[PDB]
């Protein structure tokens, strides 16, 4: 994650000194992936509708990462996971492309957490994009509920003195003077 | 009167010893009111009875001075058999180091570490040794818990003092911290008002120019 | 200098009192300054009495707009708040004490009465005021103090009041922000009267040498538990009482800004509503210091004695 950002920063300001004012085609690819990393689609969508049409037509994996976000956008996670593991990213975008696998299983297992007190369990295994049976043991070991009779899932849901000093601190100077 | 019976037998057992001393603390056992046994264990005669043939009534006295109750349980075969006062007074004892660690105590930890079957029972032994001053807590029958406010402290078995120097030196260092934190507060403090004071006497001689200038 | 308060200089005096400033305007005192020791003195008197009220005179002298409290001594008197000038009848225990006091270098002379309103705030009745205005009438230069024993302790926050009264037929002019105070229902319908009638005079005290001596004993013992919990401001009833002080000065200075907007060109309204404005955000930061040092005192004691090791 970390390195992400790292990376994500260091390719930012690639393309912004871009001699020749386009970057390199890695440079995009991975500018793109990191965004759907972040969930950040509308710097996703922004940065595919300022890549020029050539690049697209000469790198065809480009729009390969453009039609997965486009899914991530509409987030039909059962056709995320498929269009994720279709397409071979190279190996500057087949760890990141993983990345971005791991976090949309997190982002849905919250997002089923959260919101949903009671779920089918197709429901949640295309959520998860696994079959039913190992996402019950997955969620079992996870101290969750499961209702075999009616396929149902039940999910639980889940300052230094030094700085208190300074700020109470801060707090009689200002109101000192 | 305890402390006085627990003196005139620290007096006596520096002259009569053997069964009868082993008797006499069987009947310091069995007599309401001792709560400390540290200053019998320290007599001599104690000692005299480390090296005696008799053990089981020294093991006894060694586990009312440190051990608790679920240790007895333990050693129901090399204690002499207790009496009612006797195991009341050791139950008390080991609800003193419960006491000690924590001062909310659940129902659930008392039925276990005390072998208590009923809860009745379990009432009347607390209130017995609140009202004997033992204890000084609350207890919540809602929540099952036995809320201690102040409790009675126990022995020592010289290998604590140790513990007992890191304790202290830590709080010594604690407090220290917080005067040198308390001290740069002040440090603090005072540079806030210098600063002030240079703002407002900055502000003073700008008018003072200004008012030289016109 | 802060002893220089204690240096007493009868020339000074004897010009003051020769000078008259007070008969130029009767609103001249505006301060009250009163030393460590005769507060105490008054409030230990008053408290021994404990609902019965008690009155004493007040040593002192004046200093500008100022008076100035150095000391003060009981007087046997019977029917304070009852009997119109009560301290009449101690006249020659009067003498014979401030007599005695000058032969022990006690040099001030009488500046005012002080009495006690034992769980009924700090106010002047008809029979006060009645005695004020004599003791102004002869003794211009008098200064009434009322105390509050009972709500001293029950707020912790002394309950001191200093006052001075009207001439017969003299009007008030339009300032009297009459701070709210909870006297009992017909004792505070004549408490608004009166706040209607006398003018109070700014607390204003001095820290000195009497003080620190006080402050340091009590605190190192008396203190030994700093705690005393932390917060004596819980009870909302004065930080309370300050707050909604705040919102009604506040809300009249809105509504004397808007009905100013029609007019163009009255600066007098502007200086006053600034005034205002700034008179009402100081007594809000005040309140916030005196909240801030309690927490932090709070803090610091119950982090240290919890979390120790
Ligand atoms: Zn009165």
């Given at each position: 994650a970390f390195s992400f950002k790292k990376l994500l920063d260091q390719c930012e300001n690639q393309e912004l000194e871009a001699p020749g004012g386009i970057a390199t085609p890695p440079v995009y690819g991975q500018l793109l992936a990191l965004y759907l990393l972040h969930n950040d689609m509308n710097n996703a969508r922004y940065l595919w509708k300022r890549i020029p049409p050539a690049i697209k037509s000469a790198n065809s994996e480009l729009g390969g990462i453009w039609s997965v976000g486009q899914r991530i956008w509409q987030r039909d996670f059962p056709g995320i996971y498929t269009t994720i593991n279709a397409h071979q990213w190279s190996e500057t975008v087949q760890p990141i492309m993983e990345a971005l696998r791991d976090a949309t299983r997190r982002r849905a297992f919250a997002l089923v957490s959260q919101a949903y007190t009671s779920i089918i369990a197709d429901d949640f295994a295309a959520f998860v994009g696994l079959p039913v049976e190992e996402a019950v043991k997955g969620i079992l070991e996870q101290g969750w509920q499961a209702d075999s009779t009616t396929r149902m899932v039940l999910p639980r849901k889940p300052i230094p003195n030094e700085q208190q000093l300074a700020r109470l601190t801060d707090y009689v100077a200002f109101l000192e003077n | 009167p305890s402390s006085n019976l627990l003196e005139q037998f620290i007096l006596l057992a520096k002259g009569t010893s053997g069964s009868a001393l082993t008797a006499l603390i069987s009947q310091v056992l069995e007599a309401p009111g001792v709560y400390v046994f540290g200053e019998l264990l320290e007599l001599a005669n104690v000692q005299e009875l480390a090296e005696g043939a008799n053990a089981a009534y020294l093991q006894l006295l060694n586990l009312f001075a440190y051990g608790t109750y679920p240790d007895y349980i333990a050693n129901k075969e090399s204690l002499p058999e207790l009496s009612t006062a006797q195991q009341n007074k050791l139950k008390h004892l080991t609800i003193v180091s419960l006491a000690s660690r924590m001062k909310c105590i659940?129902?659930?930890?008392?039925?276990?570490?005390?072998?208590?079957?009923?809860?009745?029972?379990?009432?009347?032994?607390?209130?017995?040794?609140?009202?004997?001053?033992?204890?000084?807590?609350?207890?919540?029958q809602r929540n099952q818990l036995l809320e201690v406010d102040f409790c009675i402290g126990r022995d020592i078995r010289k290998k604590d003092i140790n513990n007992i120097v890191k304790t202290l030196h830590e709080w010594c260092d604690g407090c220290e911290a917080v005067l040198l934190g308390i001290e740069q507060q002040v440090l603090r403090a005072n540079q806030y008002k210098e600063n002030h004071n240079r703002t407002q006497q900055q502000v003073e001689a700008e008018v003072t120019n200004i008012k030289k200038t016109l | 200098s802060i002893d220089e308060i204690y240096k007493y200089d009868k020339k000074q005096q004897q010009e003051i009192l020769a000078a008259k400033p007070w008969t130029k305007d009767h609103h001249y005192f505006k301060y009250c300054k009163i030393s460590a020791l005769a507060l105490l003195?008054?409030?230990?008197?008053?408290?021994?009495?404990?609902?019965?009220?008690?009155?004493?005179?007040?040593?002192?002298?004046?200093?500008?707009?100022?008076?100035?409290?150095?000391?003060?001594?009981?007087?046997?008197?019977?029917?304070?708040?009852?009997?119109?000038?009560?301290?009449?009848?101690?006249?020659?225990?009067?003498?014979?004490?401030?007599?005695?006091?000058?032969?022990?270098?006690?040099?001030?002379?009488?500046?005012?009465?002080?009495?006690?309103?034992?769980?009924?705030?700090?106010?002047?009745?008809?029979?006060?005021?009645?005695?004020?205005?004599?003791?102004?009438?002869?003794?211009?230069?008098?200064?009434?103090?009322?105390?509050?024993?009972?709500?001293?302790?029950?707020?912790?926050?002394?309950?001191?009041?200093?006052?001075?009264?009207?001439?017969?037929?003299?009007?008030?002019?339009?300032?009297?922000?009459?701070?709210?105070?909870?006297?009992?229902?017909?004792?505070?319908?004549?408490?608004?009267?009166?706040?209607?009638?006398?003018?109070?005079?700014?607390?204003?005290?001095?820290?000195?040498?009497?003080?620190?001596?006080?402050?340091?004993?009590?605190?190192?013992?008396?203190?030994?538990?700093?705690?005393?919990?932390?917060?004596?401001?819980?009870?909302?009833?004065?930080?309370?009482?300050?707050?909604?002080?705040?919102?009604?000065?506040?809300?009249?200075?809105?509504?004397?800004?808007?009905?100013?907007?029609?007019?163009?060109?009255?600066?007098?309204?502007?200086?006053?509503?600034?005034?205002?404005?700034?008179?009402?955000?100081?007594?809000?930061?005040?309140?916030?210091?005196?909240?801030?040092?309690?927490?932090?005192?709070?803090?610091?004691?119950?982090?240290?004695?919890?979390?120790?090791?």
């Open positions: - | 659940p129902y659930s930890v008392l039925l276990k570490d005390l072998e208590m079957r009923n809860l009745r029972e379990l009432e009347d032994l607390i209130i017995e040794a609140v009202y004997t001053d033992i204890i000084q807590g609350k207890l919540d | 003195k008054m409030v230990m008197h008053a408290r021994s009495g404990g609902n019965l009220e008690v009155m004493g005179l007040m040593l002192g002298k004046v200093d500008g707009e100022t008076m100035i409290i150095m000391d003060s001594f009981a007087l046997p008197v019977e029917g304070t708040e009852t009997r119109v000038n009560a301290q009449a009848a101690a006249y020659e225990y009067m003498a014979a004490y401030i007599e005695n006091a000058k032969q022990v270098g006690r040099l001030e002379n009488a500046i005012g009465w002080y009495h006690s309103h034992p769980g009924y705030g700090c106010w002047l009745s008809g029979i006060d005021v009645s005695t004020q205005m004599l003791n102004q009438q002869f003794q211009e230069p008098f200064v009434a103090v009322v105390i509050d024993p009972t709500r001293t302790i029950s707020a912790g926050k002394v309950n001191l009041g200093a006052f001075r009264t009207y001439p017969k037929g003299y009007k008030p002019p339009d300032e009297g922000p009459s701070e709210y105070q909870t006297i009992p229902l017909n004792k505070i319908e004549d408490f608004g009267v009166h706040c209607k009638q006398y003018y109070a005079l700014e607390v204003s005290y001095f820290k000195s040498s009497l003080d620190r001596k006080l402050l340091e004993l009590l605190w190192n013992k008396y203190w030994v538990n700093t705690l005393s919990s932390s917060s004596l401001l819980t009870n909302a009833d004065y930080t309370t009482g300050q707050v909604f002080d705040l919102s009604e000065k506040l809300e009249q200075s809105e509504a004397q800004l808007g009905r100013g907007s029609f007019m163009l060109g009255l600066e007098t309204h502007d200086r006053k509503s600034e005034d205002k404005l700034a008179k009402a955000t100081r007594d809000s930061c005040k309140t916030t210091i005196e909240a801030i040092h309690g927490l932090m005192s709070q803090v610091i004691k119950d982090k240290l004695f919890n979390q120790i090791n």
